[PDB]
Symmetry: C5
Subunit: 206 residues, 5 copies
Amino acid sequence: QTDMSRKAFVFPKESDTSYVSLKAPLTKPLKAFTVCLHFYTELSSTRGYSIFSYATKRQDNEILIFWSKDIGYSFTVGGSEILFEVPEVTVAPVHICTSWESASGIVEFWVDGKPRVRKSLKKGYTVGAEASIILGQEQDSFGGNFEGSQSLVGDIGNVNMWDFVLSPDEINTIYLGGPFSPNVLNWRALKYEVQGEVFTKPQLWP
Amino acid sequence: QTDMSRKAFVFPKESDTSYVSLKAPLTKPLKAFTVCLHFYTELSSTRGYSIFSYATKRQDNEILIFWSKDIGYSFTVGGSEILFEVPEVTVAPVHICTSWESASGIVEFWVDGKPRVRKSLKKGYTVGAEASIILGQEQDSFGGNFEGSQSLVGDIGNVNMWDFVLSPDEINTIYLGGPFSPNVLNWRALKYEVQGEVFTKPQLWP
Amino acid sequence: QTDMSRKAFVFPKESDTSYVSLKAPLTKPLKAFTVCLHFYTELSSTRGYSIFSYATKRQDNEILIFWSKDIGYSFTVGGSEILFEVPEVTVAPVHICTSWESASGIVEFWVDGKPRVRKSLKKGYTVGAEASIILGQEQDSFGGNFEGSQSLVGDIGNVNMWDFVLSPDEINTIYLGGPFSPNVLNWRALKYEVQGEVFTKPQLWP
Amino acid sequence: QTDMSRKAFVFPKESDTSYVSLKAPLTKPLKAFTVCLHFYTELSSTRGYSIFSYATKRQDNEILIFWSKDIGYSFTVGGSEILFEVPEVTVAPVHICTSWESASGIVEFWVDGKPRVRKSLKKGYTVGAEASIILGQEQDSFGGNFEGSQSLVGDIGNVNMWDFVLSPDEINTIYLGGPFSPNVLNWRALKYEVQGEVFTKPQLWP
Amino acid sequence: QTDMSRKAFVFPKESDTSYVSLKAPLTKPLKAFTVCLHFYTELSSTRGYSIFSYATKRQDNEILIFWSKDIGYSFTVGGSEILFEVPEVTVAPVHICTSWESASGIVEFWVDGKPRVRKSLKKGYTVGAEASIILGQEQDSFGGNFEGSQSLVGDIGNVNMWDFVLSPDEINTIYLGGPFSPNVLNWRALKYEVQGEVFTKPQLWP
Ligand SMILES: [Ca+2]
Ligand SMILES: [Ca+2]
Ligand SMILES: [Ca+2]
Ligand SMILES: [Ca+2]
Ligand SMILES: [Ca+2]
Ligand SMILES: [Ca+2]
Ligand SMILES: [Ca+2]
Ligand SMILES: [Ca+2]
Ligand SMILES: [Ca+2]
Ligand SMILES: [Ca+2]
């Protein structure tokens, strides 16, 4: 447990080896989740890259938040992909929240406090509880098989995770800096393992 | 009779079976009406869709609020169509109000509280009272004959209906969040039948 | 005699026969004037139309506020026209004031409270007092000879006329709301005649 | 001495005969100065024009503020010219302040209270104090030899001149309209001489 | 020790002879530094120019802040360049802070108080402390070999340097203007040497 308030991980150059593993304390697989984070990179108009990689032994892309070059955000649950297209590329730190619900198949994707349209993905599915959660790289195996061309060059912080769906009002307060209590991953009480060229500095965003 | 305050219908994927049917004890025939609603979809740049379908046994498009690809808003009364071109599209939730008056034929269209030009459509006409009112699909027959290529993928909410033409100040009240009392369809006292892949969730718009 | 406060004239479709005739107490040739009005149309990027037509038995375009397609505003006094070009069109209600002073020849044109450059037109000319003043049509003879290709389709209101040149501070209050007393045509004490399909409804602009 | 507060000289059309002559109580050869003024014109994308023409018996272009078409502002001291390029022209009234210092050669150019870079011009030169100062025309001789194609068509006012360089804070006050006292040319106590078709009217800018 | 508060060095025109030499209490090797300054120029779209030149006997480009035509900001340390692309150029005064840390190799670049992404440069290297610090000119040798082609035409001011990396909150204070004390170069206690055509005038920025 580390309090990472006002701190962010920094991956200053492209690599195959720099990553942070996030220790999720769980048993019950997930019928729903919400993932929020800040990140900052210039890669957006040169190549794709992995924002948040959640892998299980049977599924490498169990939850994957990814950026596809000339497309926008790619959201994947259980190997199935949905896109959140972005016409114009923004050059500044970005806060995203994303949720998915098994019961309904509804995914929500929130960019800088503003919501994209609701979409459907993996209705009735269950996300596995024994996971390998990675920042800075895209998993192709449980905890490994990284590709440098999918690596995050930049900052990533305020990563949080819930095992239910956040409401629009709740997302609004997280974004506005208000109080909250995540029950899967907590930035303020995070367990983690650093590997490779990655540093802990003060966050660049306000 | 359900209080749908702060909630919206969610049509998270394309189909020809998902819809909501709105019910009312319908009074005398209509010599005028106003219908206001919020909706949010990403379909505007890809194909057309139906936003509000009001059908009678005699006319499948008795009142139709439609979006027409590369053109803009389509507003139909008694089978006759009028257009409100929209040069660039906004990728955000949208609030609309629209009215028609039999006496003058005057049609109004309001987008996020701002009025379009007043136009003319079906003067002397009388809108049928025995009707089938549908969200999510375009009627080609009374209560049916939907087309998937005309389905709404997204959210729709705050649907209200009056049997008279709202003044500009009254439209202002509706849009700014003031209290009001609609006399045909009331989102706070909504009587409806849900069908296929439709969800009730908290509204995405303020 | 009629108080037209907060009400506008509505010309909902193209026609040869819909117009309003404005009656002024007027009885001394004009050596100067000012005309202010509000109008709203979509015709601007399709064809020209007449905003304010002041005909005299010897001159059909004695005063004419007109929109020329792909050019901008046209202002004519005693048959002589000058242009106020607009590179880009606004799709919203628009408030205009315009003045002319025989003594100097100076013409002013104000759009949404914002002045164009001062220009010169018909210095030392005199504007006739016996007049036919028409909204919705362009006159080619005292009180008639209209053409549908020059008709106003939309809303026009807040029409006021003075017999002297308003100052910049005076136009500023006229545009923002303020009190004023026009001495030729008064929107709050207006005498008029309606002809054809033209309607009185609440104004769309604040 | 006339107080020209809230008033401006109007040059309604093109001519080589319309101009205002400004009377300084001039004194000793100047080794610094600052000139501020408001002007409004539409000639900007058609031709150039003189804004401020200061000629001495020996130097016709002793101080000249000019607008060069397709380029921007042209500032000339002692016959010697420097440019201030303007990529995009705006059609609105504009306030400019310019200064020059002999000791350093430093020229300053201010447009709407915002400064252009500092530039170098005529270091160690002295500006003749026995001068003819003209508005609305460009001098090619002491007090004459105008050219119609260099003529200002539009309004010019708020003309003041000091015999020293104004600081950034001092300019900011002038631009904001704060209280100030010029010692060479005072708009509030102006001695001038009008010739041709030029009119005094209320200023069009705030 | 001169307090250069509210003042800037002005380089009115291109040359290879005008420069300012900054003098620092010649301490020990730098394992980290931060440099902050204001500058205002119009050269960005015509050619590249040197903002801040820090040169040792061994290395001509020991710390070099530069502007590269059609590229953006060039930040170089111990001969290794890193780029910060700027798609669109702002013709206004600009405040930058840059920092480098040996331990991590992380560089930071801050434009008008907004951070660019963290990049990597010269990890483990050490910046020499026997230095020549020049404004207005680019060094290709210790205190010499200037190319007018690389000279700053404009204003430069509020130069401050620290021997450690400033935090995000610290940089906000420097940009918004709060109180601070730099330990390498203090603009409020500056020792310097002026050469050529360079003057001291009031700063143009707040
Ligand atoms: Ca993968
Ligand atoms: Ca991979
Ligand atoms: Ca139909
Ligand atoms: Ca259909
Ligand atoms: Ca005519
Ligand atoms: Ca005609
Ligand atoms: Ca000349
Ligand atoms: Ca001349
Ligand atoms: Ca060098
Ligand atoms: Ca060099």
